[PDB]
Every structure is written in structure tokens, then in C-alpha cells.
Amino acid sequence: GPQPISRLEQCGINANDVKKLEEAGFHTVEAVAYAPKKELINIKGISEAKADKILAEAAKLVPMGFTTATEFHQRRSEIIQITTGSKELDKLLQGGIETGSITEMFGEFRTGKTQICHTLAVTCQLPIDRGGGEGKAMYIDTEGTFRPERLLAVAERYGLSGSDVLDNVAYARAFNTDHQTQLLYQASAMMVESRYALLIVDSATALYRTDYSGRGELSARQMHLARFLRMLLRLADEFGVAVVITNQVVAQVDPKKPIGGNIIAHASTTRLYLRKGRGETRICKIYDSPCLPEAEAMFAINADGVGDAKD
């Protein structure tokens, strides 16, 4: 899909500057093209005189001009949608998780966000005709609640061997917000090398609540989260992959709202509201979507992952 950054070398950009790019997090030409002047100036071995040359060079390699809605529609006819493992959810999402956008799943505890992430980590590897994303998977955990047994269970549910599914998912533990961001640079790098289909951060806001604390650090928290979210969107556009984030909630006291403020609400293309049903089943609700109508679904959690309720 994406063209490697080394494409700049032969066309008229020499070695020192390009080799200076990657350790700033740019492993693709598109990332350089999508970046403004400011993101190029900051690193040491680059001056403005050649910064504009690099940007102008990267411009002609990737179409960044105006297009008619027709071609975009034809490009959005080929966008892959990853099944969730449940028929109800798939009909609510009209196919499942759409790649190339940021999906947010929020709710109280036990609402099932972790299991959806686990099932997505496996369903992303299915063939396209099976509703799968047909690619690798990346899981970033900020809570230590990654339990591969669920991956094994769902893998066997579709008849996939348990060995390959485990070897074919990327994992990392975020201990603070800063470490939670350096992983995104590895996200860029590794996706250049291998075909990924899904990016998961669980949770994208768990460590932000405590690291940034009080009305004082709120502004800095929002800025850090916004940069986090802009990085993610860049990853989604530069590799065309599904970004699924999990968010926590806070009770409204004056009946619950997701945390993160308006920043995560705007950044998130699609938000899903999760609430408990009866027993193992739970309720999913579309919180935000540009074209999808506001509706509901009835999804269950079984010993073999998210699926359909018996009734």
C-alpha cells in the first residue's frame, strides 16, 4: 500500500536528510507529505531551505489536490469493514468496523470493551470474504488487562489455528502517557514493514486521568491527548487501518459521560455507547457517526468472545 520513505532517495533527495527523517518518526513518504513545515523544522539536521524542497518533492508522489466526489466514492466502495463477530453489531455498523477511521468505545466497567478489542484482534485476520480485515493486529494496553486466552477462544471459534493468531498480533504495555506516545512511533515503523489491519489502544485515556491531575494540568492533558489523537489519525490515513480506542466514563453530578472532554469527542469519527444488559448480554448504542443513523444493538459476551445472544 504505502510507499516506503526511501522513494525520496533516487528522485533527488540525498542520504543524510532522509536518514535524519526516520528517527523523528517518519518512515513513509506520505507522513512527510502530510506533515507541515513546523514538524520538519524541529529536528536538527534540516533547514528550511531544503525543507520546502523535501515537501515539494513529496507532493508530486502522493495526490494532495482536489478531487471530485465520484472517485472518492469509488475509493470508499473498496474500504474494508471488519466484522465484530456479532450479527447485530455488524448490521448496526453495516458491515462492521470501518478501517481508516478512529472508532471509540466507551462505557462503565464490564461493558465489554476489552472483549470487543480481543475479538477484533482476531477477526481482523480473517479473509475479506469472511468479513475480516486480512492483516496483522496491534494491541496497546495501558491497564495490563490483555488476556490471550480470549484470543485463543475466538480463534478456535472461526476454526483458525491457535498458534499463528498469537504470533501475528503486536503487543505493548504503556506505563505512562509519554510511553503511551512513543509506542505510536513504533506503530508507524512496524506497519511500514508488515501489513497491519487493526490498531487498538486500551485504554487511550486510562493513564491520562492520573498523570495529569487537577484543574491545573487539565489544559496540558487535553493538549497531550489531542496530539495523541492527531498522531493516530495520521496513522489511520497513512496505512488505511482501523483505529479502535476505548474510553472511560465519569458520572455527571448535578447520567454518565465519557471522559476526555470535547477533544476526544471531535477527534473520534465514530463513538459507541456500551451499557450492560441482562446477564452476559449487553447493549451497544451509536454515540457519534457522520452517516450512520442513531440506533441500538444487542450484543452478548460468551466464553468464545463477543457474539450473538441465545435469544
Ligand X SMILES: Nc1ncnc2c1ncn2[C@@H]1O[C@H](COP(=O)(O)OP(=O)(O)OP(=O)(O)O)[C@@H](O)[C@H]1O
Q: Choose, by CB under 8 A, the member of 11, 41, 56, 250 that binds a copy of itself.
A: 250
Of residues 269-288, which lie at the interface with Ca ion (CB under 5 A)? Answer: 288
Of residues 186-205, which lie at the interface with a copy of itself (CB under 8 A)? Answer: 186, 190
Q: Choose, by CB under 6 A, the member of 259, 265, 298, 309 that binds ligand X.
A: 265
Q: Find out whether 109 is annotated in a ligand binding site.
A: yes
Which parts of 12-147 fold into alpha helices (H)?
A: 15-21, 29-34, 37-41, 48-59, 69-76, 87-92, 113-123
**Cell numbers found for residue 139:** 494491541
Binding of residue 179 to a copy of itself (CB under 8 A): yes
Integer angstrom CA distances of residue 215 from 210, 212, 219, 221: 12, 9, 8, 10
Q: Choose, by CB under 8 A, the member of 14, 72, 130, 296 that binds a copy of itself.
A: 72
Integer angstrom CA distances of residue 273 from 90, 123, 267, 286, 288: 15, 21, 16, 6, 9
d(CA 192, CA 138): 13
Binding of residue 110 to ligand X (CB under 6 A): yes
Binding of residue 279 to a copy of itself (CB under 8 A): yes
Binding of residue 309 to a copy of itself (CB under 8 A): no
Binding of residue 44 to a copy of itself (CB under 8 A): no
Q: Find out whether 112 is annotated in a ligand binding site.
A: yes
Binding of residue 251 to ligand X (CB under 6 A): no
Cα first-last separation, the chain: 42
Q: How far is the CB of 145 from ligand X (least distance, A)?
A: 5
Cβ closest to a copy of itself, residue 10 vs residue 70: 70
Binding of residue 286 to ligand X (CB under 6 A): yes
Of residues 112-141, which lie at the interface with a copy of itself (CB under 8 A)? Answer: 114-115, 138-139
Quick check: 44 and 63 in contact, CB under 8 A? no
Separate counts of helices (H) and strands (E) for the chain: 14, 13
Q: How far is the CB of 291 from a copy of itself (least distance, A)?
A: 4
Q: Find out whether 299 is annotated in a ligand binding site.
A: no
Q: Binding partner of residue 112 among Ca ion, ligand X, a copy of itself, none, CB under 5 to 8 Å per kind?
A: ligand X
Residues 6+ apart with CB under 8 A from 169: 121, 136, 137, 138, 139, 151
Q: Find out whether 149 is annotated in a ligand binding site.
A: no
Binding of residue 290 to ligand X (CB under 6 A): yes
Binding of residue 292 to Ca ion (CB under 5 A): no
CA-derived radius of gyration, the chain: 20
Quick check: 88 and 186 in contact, CB under 8 A? no
Q: Choose, by CB under 8 A, the member of 129, 290, 310, 311 that binds a copy of itself.
A: 290
Query: CA 55: distance to chain centroid?
Result: 26
Q: Find out whether 26 is annotated in a ligand binding site.
A: no
Binding of residue 180 to Ca ion (CB under 5 A): no
Residues lying near ligand X in the complex (CB under 6 A): 109-115, 143, 145, 265-266, 280, 286, 288-294, 301-303
